[PDB]
Structures are given as structure tokens and as C-alpha cells.
Symmetry: C5
């Protein structure tokens, strides 16, 4: 895989797509592939009944976790030419939450808490690394693909850390992190904010682009004719339910790249 | 489409200053179009008497929501040349709120909470997208144009998400977000801050401009001889009432653009 | 009509340093400003009283814009303010605030940081924060009009020039539609418990040239400084910096006719 | 009377590193120079035993206030000078560790350091020019150790003609009573940040690959006209369990070249 | 010693390594070298039983403190390393470092449906050097001794160590036993070393961590010289603390490094 020069940006050598990627929340019902919930509001987080021996901090309902969202783009068909993602815009679809959250005797409720803002854009699926937040965290007993291994040994990156590729919408954001040792031909960016009551701050607009060229001036190459978008966003909780943007918008700019073959 | 800019001359330039008033929903039914409240302080958010079946978190009073504000500018006739907005300044009209908020045994009350800061500037009305914050949010039963559809399916961007254009001051800021897939010939910018007690931070001054040229050096073109200003700003709540800046100021700079016809 | 700058010479340059004092309203019977950096306590009146403190507070508990004028030496040619430094005079408040059983009290709350510099007084716009806010019954020049109609900028919005130290910062905001030949900058921070953050130093300047390279022109031979700063409250009293420092740099400008 | 810089040479350059200790007031009284406490943790702030007439918000124990720290540097003599030493750049860096276990807990609830903060340094060819101020209409300062601003506290909470001036020539100037004088301090660089609030988290960065240039608009640094450089500084991170905390030290590395003068 | 010119970037003269450095928490159990816990979650901080005399704010369990993590890199041996006039040595000229982190929500539990969060006092620190990190011994309190096992505590009276003075002990981070609450990097030393640290106080302060894969940190000094591996080794030392949750300290799952070496000429 040797990279040559960019093709002169022409009408039939350029390609643009806009798309909205929906947020994903886990599904407790068992089906045939499990179905994602496209929700921007989860079920309530709460300790189970007195008698029950399910510990919600160890095995939460799939209902109350966010998984990475997925989308694939196959640009039109074309000493070899391949599609190159050289820039993009991405923007969050978001409204302020006030009235919908209710009030306690006129004290307005608000959206706040632990947050994630993540996007990834690559010529193959996102390489991910399996982790536990706690010595006792197993994940949901349905829907989610949980990291294989003893939770007591996975709260640190070690030789037994499991690796995986985000090829379905079943990877919980609380259990899998992007693998910085892999993800070649891929740009990603993530921001985690902790705290129980941390206000989320989101900006959006329509006159701002993200360049995607590396140190050599090479963007993402679609070597198998596909671009893999993977992303996840979490704004905090409100009334014990996790909230998400209504969507993550992408506009992708492709040119053509010469590759030796 | 677009040719060269006309040499900046006295006859070929045009400037306007204006203040855009904030909009709050009106509970009284009209006689005639519904009338906006130009208020920077809403009615109190509070639950109904425990007998009542109106759920304020599902159908709030129009009284307690902010809608997008509107203004149109028609620059003077031209004796095809078209008006082009190439830069502007916009500034919030704001004072600190201290004494007016009262106190509790000398404990000074403050303005804080969930915030929005938004402006848009375009050759046509703002393209907007209909959304729900909750699986149960319907919006006010009067005044507001609410997003058509089942609230259970609108909390995520999907094939059923309704589209609209902000052509009246009846679009609640809690239900409609700018459409990033549209809004060509338009620049907008939005910031949303969550939280129930988040302090607002506003800066203002008179020596700062916003350039409005795109990647090609083209500003907003008034193809039908009009510029559409649409904006909304929310600073938080105080004593259960939402506050807004007293106004949003704009100064618009137009030159003339030669256009192939 | 503005011409070229005069070559920077010894007699064509002028510098002044000054401290501008904060202003708090005065309840007693021109009315005299209180030059205080700490106000009276905000509290409701006794139960019997018909005075509503959120509608008509004591002048005692509000900050008004501070004023200073500078007339550079006599010299056609006119004095031009082309740069300045401004800096807040400030100390951390710890012991002075007291404590509740060892829990140290702090300064926090709603803030304003504002300065303006112009060849005429600051153009200001009258506003109400509430449908019911009238302002203090003495000292302050309150915005004329029904409070129910002034919480939004409209036709009834009164205009005024800051020509005395009686303009409450809670009722008057700089007019962005006017204030030609003037730079100003303001920051407002809300919240009841918001920590103030203030930086200061002595190696930082603010340029004051506009898009044309023209600073503030003293067309009537005067420079008008107007400013106000509020750090929050402590024990129900509003605090201010001890002063706002300015150093002004003037050159000469040829103004045609 | 400033001329050109001397060509950077081995003999014409000079570097020093030093740690400046934080200063807290000392209650044990005078007769003789009072002794500073070099502490990064003060005594507890608390009201006196009920019935007492000492008001801690008006006259606190010297124990519970931070004073400006001092250090002087005299670079080596200049074989037949007039050439003078010029501080043209420096690095300064806070010596700091996160406080967790040491702060204790309340039924498993970890205590933290938070509160009102100051971060200040000054570097000059003479002592720091300072201005006397009161935070309150009733604040007198500690009845021992500290040099308190002269005047009625009711008239000192604003800068006016009654504002006393002083030079930081001892480690007895309380940070709560004296602020750098922006109308003076020629041949001096200083920088200060004040953060209010009772529970404000401090944020401190440090590293070893970052310098602060000290040249003014003319390309002139601090000139040691009497052969000395005066370092004055103070840093406060907040409180923990009613005691004020400080960095363990403020580090400086100073870079001198020589400046020719007439 | 006397640094000469960089060797022309070649295939033969370049070297890259990626590695993950594990966080370190103290170990209470006990003969040989004490074993670090590679945990991103500590034991609970709690006072002892009302009948005990161990004061947890003076001598905490090794269990509840973070120590500096260590890693060493020895790049490949150099062909024709020494000549008449000079020798070639490995020079670290840039790196990327990135935290391995996930949001903690469900794992933290809840009280009546009020979701728990990770918050509190934080440290973000990395160091990269041709020798071990020079560190300075300090006390946060006039009474803090540190854990009675595992940790190498600063020698001296705690009453005199809460300030930098002539009694301040110096040390090199040569094992994973230096508690982050007792030892700070020495700015008066650490030549041929770049380090960077951020401390955030407060009991309830939210941590904010960014990560990505298109950002590098240059490591050249004022002269254009990076870290020189004069004894053929690069020493990585680092520590990161995100706050507490349910009385236990949390850490990133790891700190990732990618190191870029070229060759540097040096007069012997």
C-alpha cells in the first residue's frame, strides 16, 4: 500500500455527502441480531427492588448505556485511484432542555453530569480496546458486547486487554475506548467530562471545517471503497435518565488519490 | 451563479443598525395571528394544582418558553447586481441582575441555568428541524407551532423529523433546531449550555466584527432583495422565570455582488 | 473629517496615570457618591414595611458608573488616545469575610467588568431587569417609563449620557447604536455563587485604533473615562475592586476643519 | 540612560536558580525583628471562645494570613563597570503536589483544598512598590507581626489620597492588605491573578520547557542599577479544614546579560 | 557534554515505539521487592474504627495512594556508533501521549436514582528523560508521614518538610514506590528531561480529559535539542489521577506514548 499524488480536484473526481448519525442506547428485549434503540433519552437509572439480587452498578440494564453509533459511506465507483476523505464538517444537533425536564416546587430541573463527545472517521472499522471502570463491572446481561475477561484484571491496560472492531452498534461507551496503538488510516477525537452535576457546553454552526490530512498531507483512504463513521455523544443525566444530542451531523468531502498497485 | 464583487463605492455600500427583541410565548388566544410577548423575563415555571391533569413538563404554558426572534432588512433598490452581506457586528444588550432578583434572609438570588446563544443571517428564512427533548414533550397547547409527529419518535433525527422555515415568531427554541443539511446562503452560530444553576457569561463591546464570507469569499446574497435575521438568547432562570438579554443588536454591512443571470 | 497623525514627538505626546474609584449609591440627602468598594447589606425590610427591596432597593446596595475626565495640555490639531493600559486594584478577601464555625466565607456572585473611553460622555440605554423594578427612591437617576415596558429594547427605551455618578449599573447599559468615537468593553457574569477571576500586571497594553487606524479624538479637548466593576457579594454586601487604574497615551491628530 | 546590550559572552552572562519559601504570619510577639513562618499550611481560621471581644474578621491571628515572600540576588561584580546586570528572561514554576489523604475525610467523604486564591510574582531592580488597602470598612489586620496599612479602615477600602504607599522590604506585608502599585514599579515586571469564592478549586500547571520574556516595549529587561535583583512573590491555593494552603515553594531561574549605560 | 549536529533522518537512523504505561497504586501486603498494584481504582478512603489509634490522614493505607509509574525504552544498538571525533546517540525529538479513558456512569452506582460521579482532586503528569526523574520530598501537612508500608516516604520531620528548605530530601524515581502526594518533580534538576504537570484541587471537581490521534508534542529545547539517551535508555515516568468516586481514587486505564527517535552526534 504505497500512496502517490492527489488527483486534480475536478467535477467527476470530487464527492460530497451529508448525513445525520443517530445516537444509540441499549435494548433490554431479546429478539436474529439485537435491535438498537435510537433514543436521545435513556431509561431511568435506579437500584432494583429490595429483594432482587441484581446489582445495577455491576450489571446495568442495556436501557441505561450509550453505545457507539455507526454509519458507512460508499462513494461512487471509479496506477490506481481511490477515494480520499480530506476534510469534513461535523456538528451536534441539540436544543436547550428546560420545560421538558420538569420542576420540584418551581425549582427548574437541568441536564448535567458525566459527558462524552466522540467522533471517528476511517477506511476500516474503529479499533477499540476493552476495559472495566471498576473491579466488579460486567456490563448489561443482554444486548451489549461486553469485554471478555475478569473485571478485576481489566481496569488497567494489560496483555490480557481484549481488542475489537466496532462493527455493530453494541459496544458500550462505558466499556470500550479507542485503541491508540491501532487506528491507522483513521482520525478520531474524544472528550470525557466527569462529575455528577457538570453542565454540558455544546457549540454548533455552519462555517467551520475540520482538516483530516496527516503529517504527509494524506487524508483517510477508502482502500475497500468505504468510509467508516463511528461516533458517540452524551450530555449528562436529567431525572436519572441519560441524554444525548438528537443526532451528529457529518458532511464529508472526498477527492481521488493515486495509490501504487 | 456568482460573479465578482462591485468596487466598494458610496452608492454601492449600505449599513443598518437594529435591535432585535426577545420573544416569549403568549397564552391568550388571538382575534388575527397570535401576538408575541417581547419580554426578557418569562412567567414562573410551576406545577399545576395537584388536582389538575395538565402536566407542565409535557405541555408548558406558552408563557414559559423562548421562541426565535425575527427581523427582515430590505436594502435600497438598485438602479444583475445584488446586495451582499459581507460582515456584521452583533452584540448582546445586557445588565447584571442583582437587587431585582430579591433575597432570602439576605442571601442574594442570582440568574443561572440552561442557556442558548444563537444568531442566523440569511438570504431566505432559517431552515429548522423539529425535535422533542423527551418521549412525552408536546409543547404549549397554544401559540407555538409544535413539531408534527409522535413525541416518542421525534427525540432523534429520523425520516419523520419535520422540517420548517422560521417565518413567524412562534418557533419554540426547545423544539426546533437549525437544520445543518440545509441553510445554504446563510451563516448561523449556536451555543447551548445545560445545568440548572450554570452561570451565564456574556461579553460585549464595540470594536469587534464577524466576517461572513465562505470558502469562496462570498457573503450572504439577498437574491430576493431581503436579508433574514433570526436569533434567540436565553441566560438561565431566576425565581423560576426564564431571562433573556434585553435585545440583540446587529449592524449589517452590505456591498454589491455581480451575479450571472 | 480626519487627516494624518502628527509625527510622535516630545511636545506632541502626552501621558497620564489615574485611579478611578468605585461608586456606590448614597441614601442620605448635588447628591454625593459613596466611594466604597463594599456596599451596605442587602436584606428585606421588617415585616410591617411596604417597601419591597427587589423593586426599590436602598441606593446603598447598588453600583453606579464611575466617571473621570482628562484634559490634555493646550496645543487644526487635536489630541488622540491611541493606546492605554487598564488594570484592576484588587486583593484576595479571606480573613476579612469571617467564618461560620471554621467554614471560611468567600466573595462570589454576579459580576460586571466594564470600561469606556471616549471624546464625549458614554451613551447609555435605560432598561429594567424585571417588570417591577423601579430602582432606588433617592440618589440614582432611574430610567423614565413604566417598568413593565422597559425590560426589552423598544420605542419607549430612554437614552441618556453618563454625565454624573448616579447611573446604576443595574438599570443602564451602553448604547451600541451610538458611542461613536468611543471604545468600550463589558463582561457580565450571573449566578449567586460565581467566583470572580481577576488578572493584573504591568506589561500589557490595549490598542484603541479602529478599522481606519484612528483612536479616540478629543474634539472638545477632553477624554471621558467611564467604568464600573463588581466582584460579587460577601455577607450580603456587594464588593468592588479598590480602584480601576488607567494609563492613557495621547498623540496629536490633524482634523480637517 | 540606557544604551546597547553587551554581546552575549561567557563572562557577560549569569544564571541562578532558587526556591522562594511561602510566608505566614507569626503570633509570638516583638521587642527586634519578628520571625516569619515558612509554612505552606496556616493555623485554623476560627472565631474565639464565646464572650471574647476579639473579632477574627477584623483582627485575625497573624497565623492565618499570607505575606509577600522576599529574595534578593546580587550577580557577580563587573571588572571595572558603566556596565550593569540586566534580567532579560526567567522561568518561574510552582512546587506543588495534589492534596488528598492528608486532608482527611468525614465518614468516607474525601476533603479537598479549595477557596480564594492568589498567584503573584514580581521581579525588579528595587523593592516592590505596594499600596495599602482594606477589604472591609472594619478590617485592621493582625495586632502583631504584620505591617498594617496606616489610616482609618473606613477610608482605605478605596484608592484615594489617604492610600498609604510602601515598599516590600520585609516579609511582613499581608497579601490581604497590600496590592502592587501600578502607578509606580518602574524597572519591574509583576503579574497577579486573584480568584474569589469559598470553594473554588485551584488549578496549577508546571513544567521545565517554558520561559517568560521580560523585555519592555524598547527591548530592555530589568536593570540592576544598585547591583541587586529583587524577587517578591506570594501564592495561595485556598483553604482545607479551615487552614490556608500555599505551594511548598516558588522556583525561579534568572537569566542575566550585561547592559551598557552612560 | 558537547552536542553536535543531528544525523540526516534515514530508515537506519529512525526509531519508533508505542507503549501503554499502567497506573500504580500502593500495596499493603508484605522477602523481596514490594509489588505495585496496577489498578485504576484504589481502595476506599475511610477512618478506622472509633477504637483505633491509626490516623488515616497521617498514615493512610498504601492502598489509597497513587505512585509515579515507570517505563524504560532502550532503542536498538548503533552501527559504527563511535568515530575519531564523536559518537552517535538516540535523540527523542517528538512524541504523542494520550490518556486511555472512558466515562464512568453506571459503574459508580446511585443513591435513590441520583447518579454518582467521578470528581475531586486531580493530577496529570508526564516526564521523559535520558535518566530517572529528579524528585523532591515534601509534606502536605505538619503531620503527614505517608503509608507505613510500600511507599518510600520523604526522610525528615513532617513539621519541617511542608516547605522547600535545606532539609528537603532529593531522590530519583527508580521504583514505582514514590507517592504522588509526597514527591514533586525537582525544577532545579531534571536536565535532559521534559516534564509537565497539572494539579487540580477541590473535593468535587470534575475531571476533563481530551484524547485523539492527530496531535504531537515537540520536545526540542531552545537549541533544537531533544532528549539524549546518553546511556542508551529513555526513562518515562508519569502519573494521572481523575478524582474519587465512592471514596476510591480513580486513574486512567493507562497512559499511551508513541516515541520518535532520531540520531544525534555528540563529542565524547
Amino acid at each position: 500500500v504505497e500512496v502517490l499524488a492527489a488527483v486534480p480536484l475536478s467535477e467527476e473526481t470530487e464527492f460530497k455527502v451529508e448525513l445525520f448519525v443517530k445516537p444509540v442506547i441499549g435494548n433490554t428485549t431479546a429478539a436474529r441480531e439485537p435491535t438498537p434503540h435510537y433514543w436521545s433519552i435513556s431509561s431511568a437509572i435506579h437500584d432494583k427492588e429490595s429483594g432482587s439480587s441484581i446489582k445495577v452498578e455491576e450489571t446495568p440494564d442495556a436501557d441505561t448505556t450509550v453505545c457507539y453509533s455507526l454509519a458507512e459511506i460508499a462513494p461512487p465507483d471509479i496506477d490506481m485511484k481511490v477515494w480520499e476523505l480530506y476534510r469534513m464538517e461535523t456538528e451536534l444537533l441539540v436544543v436547550p432542555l428546560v420545560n421538558a425536564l420538569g420542576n420540584t416546587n418551581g425549582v427548574v430541573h437541568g441536564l448535567a453530569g458525566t459527558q462524552l463527545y466522540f467522533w471517528a472517521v476511517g477506511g476500516q472499522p474503529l479499533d477499540v480496546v476493552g476495559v472495566t471502570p471498576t473491579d466488579k463491572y460486567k456490563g448489561p446481561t443482554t444486548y451489549t458486547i461486553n469485554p471478555p475477561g475478569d473485571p478485576r484484571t481489566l481496569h488497567v491496560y494489560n496483555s490480557n486487554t481484549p481488542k475489537a472492531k466496532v462493527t455493530s452498534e453494541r459496544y458500550s461507551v462505558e466499556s470500550w475506548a479507542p485503541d491508540p496503538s491501532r487506528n491507522d488510516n483513521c482520525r478520531y477525537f474524544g472528550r470525557v467530562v466527569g462529575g455528577a452535576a457538570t453542565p454540558p457546553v455544546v457549540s454548533y454552526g455552519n462555517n467551520s471545517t475540520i482538516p483530516l490530512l496527516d503529517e504527509n498531507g494524506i487524508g483517510i483512504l477508502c482502500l475497500q471503497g468505504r468510509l467508516y463513521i463511528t461516533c458517540a455523544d452524551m450530555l449528562g443525566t436529567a431525572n436519572s435518565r441519560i441524554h444525548t444530542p438528537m443526532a451528529r451531523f457529518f458532511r464529508l468531502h472526498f477527492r481521488q488519490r493515486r495509490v501504487k498497485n
